[PDB]
Design a protein around this nucleic acid. Structure first.
Ligand SMILES: [Mg+2]
Lengths: 234, 252, 57, 117
RNA sequence: CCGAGGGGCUCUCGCUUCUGGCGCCAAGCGCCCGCCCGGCCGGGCGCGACCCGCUCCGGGGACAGUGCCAGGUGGGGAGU
RNA sequence: GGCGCCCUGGAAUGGGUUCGCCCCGAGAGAGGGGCCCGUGCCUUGGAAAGCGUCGCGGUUCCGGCGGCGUCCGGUGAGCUCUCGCUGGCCCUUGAAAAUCCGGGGGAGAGGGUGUAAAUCUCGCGCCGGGCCGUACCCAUAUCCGCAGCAGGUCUCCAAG
């Protein structure tokens, strides 16, 4: 109240020192940063062929959540549970010598070299396929190959995320061969919700080119010429 | 067989410039937000002398907009500026002498020194003593102005090439004769190693294309083609004419 | 004296009791004081003469 | 986050301390230049003799890698005497000569008698 | 443009120019905790200091350059 | 000796000054101050030591022992060095850094009183200063020229 006073700082040209603002655009990045940013632009600026542009059309997150729920309890064998299973088969084999104790252990297969043999033999029933495989040619045949062999496929977001299902870092493809019978109506419920968007659209998704959009600083001045051209008429 | 004097200047052992007692590159200050959009105030503290330059320089200090600091530029000093003078710099700078401002805003027929040949170049054209350039013919669409270089060549430049109003100080320097061999020695002792120039006629055939003979004559025509190799380009290089001049130039 | 002998001295033989003691010459001190007064006072005058132009236009 | 500088300087990361799981040389080597290797013998010339009783300084010849601190401790410990100052020299055969002055509490002409000369 | 207390076919930007001074490390306002039984301390955040965006900003630009081949020129140089 | 430092005060009938200049209403002359260099003198050192001279001891270490003296002035376009002032010359403008200091700011810090704190670039007192070079010639005989070679080879001091 008595002495405390406002004392503002003029920040125009030729007055007090400009305060420490954000500056997060105008910062000289390392060259591993701008190599990493200029090529994300450069998949948006070149004309991307429709074989690469099979991707960027992935499943929406309500469908990927149901799909990872269905793929959760088909989780493969890890080495902790590989110990006790080789007990539990053989401790009863020491005690009863069962001719067949287990009829069907079901699992989801993983690996592009594994899934490929399943599709062309038509053993797989749903092919989740990744998004960001670093040499894209490791995967690009397989949406074209799932169509001809009639096996349904679906593009999910992130090769890291389905790699966590298999207790690994990335796994790039999983496939459903032998699902449980009581839960077939959860695998078959989402397959027409999937093969609408991937198999049946293959006559159209093979025509659709990608990329070829200019930057916002240059697609604005195209529009500023057109807004002049709309004023040139009216 | 021996290489000639003109070829030995490019390696630069004893033919480098004498760049010790010089004071720095005379450059206009680098552009930022202030000179693009307003003006910035600067005061000139001293008027100095480069060795080997006949133009004097001026050292101008500027209040930094970002750091609490002052910082010092070196200008090609326009003529008629003094110490303790305010120099203003930028787009909304007022056209007085010594101020530096874009050529797209100053009107036609103004007299300009130290202008950029491309935006950001910090001053390249008309920097020697007595020189200036005139602006003519603005073009507001496809923003580009033309200027008149001190060689009489008209040249189109950008609209935003930043440039200081006025003529360079030190003009009239070539009106006094050197008048004796010693003052040409001190003139080039501060610049380079080029001054005692032996005529190529007065040497041996190893040392020049024109040397030799029992008389001092050239023998071959002194005009050479432009694709002539290094070692033969001596004399009048790719000349369009010779002899004492008729007219002023009469050829673009 | 020389610069390194100035390390031996005490700050009574190294400056003067004014403001800007062993730096400025006491007649440009005298002018810097007058220059700071007379032109901050006109930044009241050109402020308030500008301030009476919006109120009577 | 904001980046108030236009510069990306690399972040301060953690730097561990070298704690290996075997020593590389298995044993600290002993000092070859200890206090007997310091001081070889005393000098007994005529100029070295008349600097003992006139000056309270006794003259030795020292190993060439010894500084005047090592000489000051290697004469105080061997001969049990206080040392004021040492003045060394490389005499042109290649051996270092030291001029060790004693405290005024001591004498040199009798310390020289109990070290032989 | 019209007209009515106003609307925005159309627009400008704006916050430093009589002078050899000074200028940063936030005042202020808004909130929140530990702190005072509806009062006292010690801390933190936002606005002050607009939002979003895909290249640091400009100037060129499919030219210039560079790689290979061809044709001119080439006592600069080589061998005879 | 120097000041381009200050105060009073105001100058034409213009004055003050230099070997030459130059300076003055943006403050002359005059009066009183302030600062810088003080390598000169006095004093402390320091007469106890040095030199000159006279005289006596001591074989020997003896930095013996004693007496007396080491005093006045003058002068200079002198020579050499130095410090300072002032001009001239340049299309020639005649180095960098390490180091060190002062100022501007004012984040803070400090005892809380009829007692002492933070701080001190003040006066003392305490401890340490390691490594390497050092002799001698420097040349009509210690260097190079095959040599004690009329050759060559960078400087300083300099009397009548
Ligand atoms: Mg000639």
């Amino acid at each position: 109240n008595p002495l405390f006073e406002k004392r503002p700082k003029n920040f125009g040209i030729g007055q007090d020192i400009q305060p420490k603002r954000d500056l997060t655009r105008f910062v000289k990045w390392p060259r591993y940063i701008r190599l990493q940013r200029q090529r994300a632009i450069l998949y948006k600026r070149l004309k991307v062929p429709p074989a690469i542009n099979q991707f960027t059309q992935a499943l929406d997150r309500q469908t990927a959540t149901q799909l990872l729920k269905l793929a959760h309890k088909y989780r493969p064998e890890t080495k902790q549970e590989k110990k006790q299973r080789l007990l539990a088969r053989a401790e009863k084999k020491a005690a009863g010598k069962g001719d067949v104790p287990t009829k069907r252990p079901p699992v989801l297969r993983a690996g592009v070299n594994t899934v490929t043999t399943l599709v062309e033999n038509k053993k797989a029933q749903l092919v989740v396929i990744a998004h960001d495989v670093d040499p894209i040619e490791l995967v690009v045949f397989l949406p074209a190959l799932c169509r001809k062999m009639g096996v349904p496929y679906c593009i999910i977001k992130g090769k890291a995320r389905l790699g966590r299902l298999v207790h690994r870092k990335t796994c790039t493809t999983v496939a459903f061969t032998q699902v449980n019978s009581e839960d077939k109506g959860a695998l078959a419920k989402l397959v027409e919700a999937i093969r609408t968007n991937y198999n049946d659209r293959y006559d159209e998704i093979r025509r659709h080119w990608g990329g070829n959009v200019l930057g916002p600083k240059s697609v604005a001045r195209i529009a500023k010429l057109e807004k002049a051209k709309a004023k040139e008429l009216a | 067989g021996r290489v000639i004097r003109g070829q030995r200047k490019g390696a630069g052992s004893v033919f480098r410039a004498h760049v010790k007692h010089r004071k720095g590159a005379a450059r206009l200050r680098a552009v930022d937000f202030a000179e693009r959009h307003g003006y910035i105030k600067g005061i000139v503290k001293d008027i100095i002398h480069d060795p080997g330059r006949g133009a004097p320089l001026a050292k101008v200090v500027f209040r930094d907009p970002y750091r609490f600091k002052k910082r010092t530029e070196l200008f090609i000093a326009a003529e008629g500026i003094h110490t303790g003078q305010f120099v203003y710099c930028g787009k909304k700078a007022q056209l007085n002498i010594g101020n530096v401002l874009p050529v797209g805003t100053m009107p036609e027929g103004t007299i300009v020194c130290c202008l950029e040949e491309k935006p950001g170049d910090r001053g390249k054209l008309a920097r020697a003593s007595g020189n200036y350039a005139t602006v003519i013919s603005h073009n507001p669409e496809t923003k580009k102005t033309r200027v008149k270089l001190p060689s009489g060549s008209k040249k189109v430049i950008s609209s935003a090439n930043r440039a200081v109003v006025g003529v360079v100080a030190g003009g009239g320097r070539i009106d006094k004769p050197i008048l004796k061999a010693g003052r040409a020695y001190h003139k080039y002792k501060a610049k380079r190693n080029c001054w005692p120039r032996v005529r190529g006629v007065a040497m041996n055939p190893v040392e020049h294309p024109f040397g030799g003979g029992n008389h001092q004559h050239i023998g071959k025509p002194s005009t050479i083609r432009r694709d002539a190799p290094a070692g033969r380009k001596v004399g009048l290089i790719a000349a369009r004419r010779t002899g004492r001049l008729r007219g002023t130039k009469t050829v673009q | 004296v020389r610069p390194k002998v100035l390390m031996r001295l005490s700050k009574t033989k190294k400056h003067v009791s004014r403001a800007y003691g062993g730096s400025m010459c006491a007649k440009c001190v005298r002018d810097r004081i007058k220059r700071a007064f007379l032109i901050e006072e006109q930044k009241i005058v050109v402020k308030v003469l500008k301030a009476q132009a919006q109120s009577q236009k | 986050k904001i980046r108030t500088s236009p510069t990306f300087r690399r972040p301060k990361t953690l730097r561990l301390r070298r704690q290996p799981k075997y020593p590389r040389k298995s044993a600290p080597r002993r000092n070859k230049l200890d206090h007997y290797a310091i001081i070889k013998f005393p000098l007994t010339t005529e100029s070295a003799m008349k600097k003992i009783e006139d000056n309270n300084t006794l003259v030795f010849i020292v190993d060439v890698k010894a500084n005047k601190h090592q000489i000051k401790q290697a004469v105080k410990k061997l001969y049990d005497i206080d040392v004021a100052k040492v003045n060394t020299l490389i005499r042109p055969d290649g051996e270092k000569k030291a001029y060790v002055r004693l405290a005024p509490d001591y004498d040199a002409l009798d310390v020289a008698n109990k070290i032989g000369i």
